[PDB]
Amino acid sequence: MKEVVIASAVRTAIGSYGKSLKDVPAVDLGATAIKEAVKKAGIKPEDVNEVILGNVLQAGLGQNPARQASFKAGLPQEIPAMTINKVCGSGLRTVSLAAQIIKAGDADVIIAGGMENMSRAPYLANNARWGYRMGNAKFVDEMITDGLWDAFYDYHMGITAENIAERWNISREEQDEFALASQKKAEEAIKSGQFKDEIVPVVIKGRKGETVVDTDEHPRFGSTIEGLAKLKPAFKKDGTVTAGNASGLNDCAAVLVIMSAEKAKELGVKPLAKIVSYGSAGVDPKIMGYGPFYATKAAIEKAGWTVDELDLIESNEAFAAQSLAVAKDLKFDMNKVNVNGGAIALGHPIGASGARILVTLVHAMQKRDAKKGLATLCIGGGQGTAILLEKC
Amino acid sequence: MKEVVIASAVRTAIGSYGKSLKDVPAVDLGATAIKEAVKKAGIKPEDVNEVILGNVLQAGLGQNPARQASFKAGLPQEIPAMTINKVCGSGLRTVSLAAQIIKAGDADVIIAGGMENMSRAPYLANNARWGYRMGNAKFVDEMITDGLWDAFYDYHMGITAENIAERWNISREEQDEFALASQKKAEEAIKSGQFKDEIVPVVIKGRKGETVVDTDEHPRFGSTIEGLAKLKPAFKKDGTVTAGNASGLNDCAAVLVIMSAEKAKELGVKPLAKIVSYGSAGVDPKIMGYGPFYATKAAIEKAGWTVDELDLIESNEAFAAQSLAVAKDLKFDMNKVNVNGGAIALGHPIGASGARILVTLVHAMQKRDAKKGLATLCIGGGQGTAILLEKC
Amino acid sequence: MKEVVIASAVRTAIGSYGKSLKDVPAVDLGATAIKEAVKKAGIKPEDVNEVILGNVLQAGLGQNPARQASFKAGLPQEIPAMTINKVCGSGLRTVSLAAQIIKAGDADVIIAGGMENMSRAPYLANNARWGYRMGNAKFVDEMITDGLWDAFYDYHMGITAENIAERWNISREEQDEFALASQKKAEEAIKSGQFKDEIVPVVIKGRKGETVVDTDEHPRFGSTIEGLAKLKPAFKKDGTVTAGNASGLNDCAAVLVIMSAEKAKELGVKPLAKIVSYGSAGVDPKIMGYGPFYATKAAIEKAGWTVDELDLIESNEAFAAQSLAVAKDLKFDMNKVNVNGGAIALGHPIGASGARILVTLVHAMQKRDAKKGLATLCIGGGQGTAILLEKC
Amino acid sequence: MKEVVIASAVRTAIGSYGKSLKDVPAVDLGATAIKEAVKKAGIKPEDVNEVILGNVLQAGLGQNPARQASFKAGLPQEIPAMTINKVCGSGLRTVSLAAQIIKAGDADVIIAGGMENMSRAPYLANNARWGYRMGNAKFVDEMITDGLWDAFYDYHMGITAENIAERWNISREEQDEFALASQKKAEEAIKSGQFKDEIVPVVIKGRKGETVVDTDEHPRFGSTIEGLAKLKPAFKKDGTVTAGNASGLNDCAAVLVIMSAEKAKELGVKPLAKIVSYGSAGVDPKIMGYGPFYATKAAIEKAGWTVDELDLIESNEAFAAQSLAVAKDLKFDMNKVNVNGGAIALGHPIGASGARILVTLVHAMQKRDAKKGLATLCIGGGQGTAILLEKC
């Protein structure tokens, strides 16, 4: 089939829950990013054949958020758009989906990625329409229900991390060390300017003030192992998982311009990387965190690669426990994993995370002259997704 | 480029607003349709590569409704699933998306379709999380907001219909005649058993009983022109659009098994039709209903067909005004359109409609010397999608 | 010490939950009752010194519901109004409060009574103002919370009834016989016209019609012991209390004009009865239903009367269990109690009940050689109030 | 009739909206105050015959808030309690109501006053019980609807202040000067310890911390006339009323122990003051602010006093405009009005305000050796209430 490339890859900074981006709707984050990704790719809005964006907390956002972001970004109305929901994997899945549409021969240029604003998720009244009749009811946290709660087992994603901790025998201490290393790498990457190429600033203008947001705010600078060790278990009594060793609730948008190699050549675009392969897989939801094992395996096999051939690795850090389990089984060289930091420090804006880690991977591969790169993440409901890139 | 075929095409009865399916979650309707579609295809669940389902009012449904439908159908958990939101076109787009993935070489068997339960849509409190602070606020109807309201023009889909009516000068009388023809064809189709093959009964587990739902309930048997003429305009004072000539709010699921011709020959599947081509298009959101014009023209062009050559046509009746305009412009033979009734009579469960009309198309084609078929529909946000089918 | 009399006593029909009065706000019911009570007293609105009305579910009713009732009745705005909340006893306490103010020398004419519309009670979001932050929360049923739940013991009023049943060993069978006697007396009373004098018809303004409500609708005509024996316990597994032997949720307004005997002689008013004495008492909230025992004993003591001397008794039937216990302890002649049915049959609109039973008492007294009457009721929170009447 | 006295008068500090007392329910404020008022009066809880407390935003507070405060304060369950709602006048009305019950001969010692927590008022869904059916609805601010919105004219209390400003021709400049003087007197009274006798501290203990609240937080220290003059109109375009010249949204509880003079003598209590007279009056709701004119007039006439005989005056400052109108018509000596400051600086916790200003008056009369004192306030819905005290 046609060769498929990434022409540009941009993301907004990742905001903290109810913090810096609390006033900026996901679709506005998405438009900011699309607009910058088009410019960076050096193509006209007119060259785009489709918009495919991830978004998980769609409640009250209005019809087709992806279509909304496309408009607000200045893209012509002629361009079709859809919104994808593969939970945590939505942002990454849109990129492989774009590669597939291109391969099928139906498009040359597709805007892919994801967007999410966890801070602005509504609460819900499920029986308002026909009435509650009598008795107290649940006022629902839509962010937990739609993005973080297992539909089948009736418990938080955090409990699937505990399940992995027990089954793979991953201690609280191990988990804390992993979390601390994530913090340290993020602080260094941030203070040394490693995300400057990737981040597109967000301008929020109020009745009087204008405020620019361009720095990832989730990371806790000067984190310590004693700091992590004092934390209480977040999800269960005597649990190993904490706020410290698990990723947070976050707001972000990350977008990539995807093109066929021939069309890039035509338009004078220098590609950042080729998409070599990808895959998705399902697992028992109670161990959803291990989804990347099978997705990474499938993708690597198709590629003809070996894990040891990989130069850089982005494995999303939803929970220390699942990332450790996955990293051990796949036999990762930890030195090549999440070099600029991971979700424990940077955050987890669900619909956009899979796109976020691929945007981070591509730019790191550029700056480090790394040739082969993997991006993979686990997905609530027991799924996994992955992509392999080879630098141009 | 592999040929893509439809192995089976199933749907539940279409429930009316707050009625027969009001207690059946969308994911359960999807699960019922999925189970029956796999059986009708005569395949093994473990040959299914992916589940791709349409669903628009995802609010409070939990993580990955497509995934829930898959799991509650008893499909193996190894199979990945994703939810698609393209509003009205979602159920049809999953089918074209499935063809694209097979054409890309990444799968041989995919479950596509859509599901929707409008009766169960919640209400939202958008500022519940960080507070309303002071002052009255909106208790939001999520069904309207995410399904039926334009995000850009801030008005109901009905006004997009009034816009086409005004622009094309389509009279109330014309609209009413079209609605009557839809109601007549639907009543005849239901009474003579035309939907018997396509519909999968839904069993509802009562407190100390069981009830079966297997009949479309939206149609108003015995509709008359005089009774339609008496209706007051629905969306605008002195408008032409009414409850009578516009589709309703409905609950349904429609699923199809999609396969490569090659895998179908290997499993000895007897395909219902070949997917010859497809298309999506974006238009001014203000005239969203005219989306099928460009989407249909694109697909037909790819096919090398003409409107003349079509034997059966399914054009969704979101509104009589937009259906009339599309039909006049595309020059359809009305005798070939919506032969068993359309959405004015049958209903419009948004996530599932694009799939529902494909189901209805393929089954109508099996009962006639109908070689060529077209399925097309308009999409809130200013889009259109279409598929062309050829009987096997 | 001036003598205090009742000049008139009126009430609306008692509506059942979500039925006939569901569209009539409590303040409108109050306004209807106020208007008729003033006319029946034959006084001029400008001789009224104060409005004092019972109302418990005030949530969202707007400022000063008593004031709204007064204004919508067409009473002069110069008249002050206040709303009283003593739960179940509110409507009766306004009457005693009125006697106290007249006895103090501060007024000659006061409108007293109560109003309630349980069908219209809202639901609440208690943390909407400053935010829920995260997590599912309760969507609160205000009717239950403000009207039927104990603030101290955290359980339903029904459990206070089970507590009395267990403590006094009042059997389900006893409770059921009492409920049947209430239903029988109510059916006979309604059919033979006993409530014709007391009830003021409520006119409801439909979309293109008018409907009149003038008949109590809670009673179940044709009630049988077998049908009551078959009911499942309402509040406790294996409990004695059921929907059958406990009162319902209802809508009503009951108003009385109260005057000094001296002002009545000056305006030539022919009084229905003299208020001889009254009492309120507090008890353990866990046995709230026994409040009438102490309240009745106190009032009787002040009067210099005995239970023997009473000719007619109105003891509110919030629950058969508590009515039985109060009656046994006070040694009532059951033939003299609730002669036209009680609240098991007629209903329990909380704000208005204490007033309703006074209305019913005075009108029953006018039809018999009933010289001495007692009105008493139990109050959630562990209280009782009582009034003693003597015919004029 | 019997002579009636105030034995003790305590209040919590007044908290600012969503500030210092946001975590302390009204009933808890009320209990803190009752407990201190009993101690200060030098009587046992056992000597109290009834609890009568004002509270306006009762929504979701559970049955009989007054009964709840009485319990939480340690008062025996035998003591009856009720909650009064006369809007702004509720707190003051309970005191005169107590005087009347005592005069009627039914009690010797009554706990009177009011309580309110505006910060904790819920939001409401009025059609949750039977359903909204379809369409956006209002998520209601219960604090505005129940305490600050005119039921009849459909506008904020602020608009009734504007109405007074226009009719009496009170300028924005006049209003600002009045507001500035209120701020200045409050700051001086606070910094000089004038409220030390009256305030009972509130201890809030969290999971870890304990925080004491004992200082009125509403006042803006160092206020200036330029500060006031820059403020925008709060309620209408080109309006005279601002946030600066109108009182705020506040939390407080104020309680008084009321006794007959004979019972005080019996128990060895030294009274703070005698209640000489009181009255309530109704006005056109559109000019509710002028209610104190007629209530003050009635009370003074009964007393046999003259305005010039008054030594101290507490006229509640809901709006500068209404207080100026009232003060002009009643010909007040401004030097004797709100000496320690008024509601513009101190706040307006509705159910408790009328009690708050009487607690302030009594203590000031003590410290200043003032002999005659007036307390009066306007009431939403067009009412007014007043009391006259003579020092013991």
Numbering used by the authors:
A (entry chain A), B (entry chain B), C (entry chain B), D (entry chain A): 1 to 392
Copied sentences from the primary study:
Here, we present the crystal structure of C. acetobutylicum thiolase (CaTHL), a type II biosynthetic thiolase that catalyses the first step of n-butanol biosynthesis and condenses two acetyl-CoAs to acetoacetyl-CoA. We reveal that CaTHL, unlike other type II biosynthetic thiolases from aerobic bacteria, is regulated via modulation of a redox-switch, indicating that n-butanol production and the relevant metabolic fluxes in Clostridium are tightly regulated by thiolase. CaTHL consists of three domains: an N-terminal α/β domain (N-domain, residues 1–119 and 249–269), a loop domain (L-domain, residues 120–248), and a C-terminal α/β domain (C-domain, residues 270–392). The N- and C-domains form a typical five-layered fold (α–β–α–β–α) observed in other thiolase superfamily of proteins including peroxisomal degradative thiolase from Saccharomyces cerevisiae, β-ketoacyl synthase II from E. coli, and the biosynthetic thiolase from Zoogloea ramigera (ZrTHL)14151617181920.
On the basis of the finding that the instability of RDR confers the redox-switch regulatory mechanism to CaTHL, a CaTHL mutant CaTHLV77Q/N153Y/A286K was generated by introducing residues that might be able to form hydrogen bonds with their neighbours and subsequently increase the stability of the CaTHL RDR. Unlike the wild-type CaTHL, the activity of the H2O2-treated CaTHLV77Q/N153Y/A286K mutant could not be recovered by the addition of a reducing agent as similarly found for EcTHL and ZrTHL. To confirm the reason for this, the crystal structure of the CaTHLV77Q/N153Y/A286K mutant was determined at 2.3 Å resolution; it was structurally confirmed that there were the change of regulatory mechanism and the stability of RDR in the CaTHLV77Q/N153Y/A286K mutant. As expected, a disulfide bond formation was not observed between the catalytic cysteine residues in the CaTHLV77Q/N153Y/A286K mutant and the RDR was found to be tightly ordered, forming a sheet–turn–helix conformation even without the addition of a reducing agent. More interestingly, the mutated residues, V77Q, N153Y and A286K, were positioned to form hydrogen bonds with each other. These hydrogen bonds seem to contribute to the well-ordered conformation of the RDR in the CaTHLV77Q/N153Y/A286K mutant. When the thlCaV77Q/N153Y/A286K gene was overexpressed in the thlA-knockdown mutant under the control of its native promoter, n-butanol concentration (7.4 g l−1) was higher than that (4.5 g l−1) obtained with the thlA-knockdown mutant complemented with the thlCa.
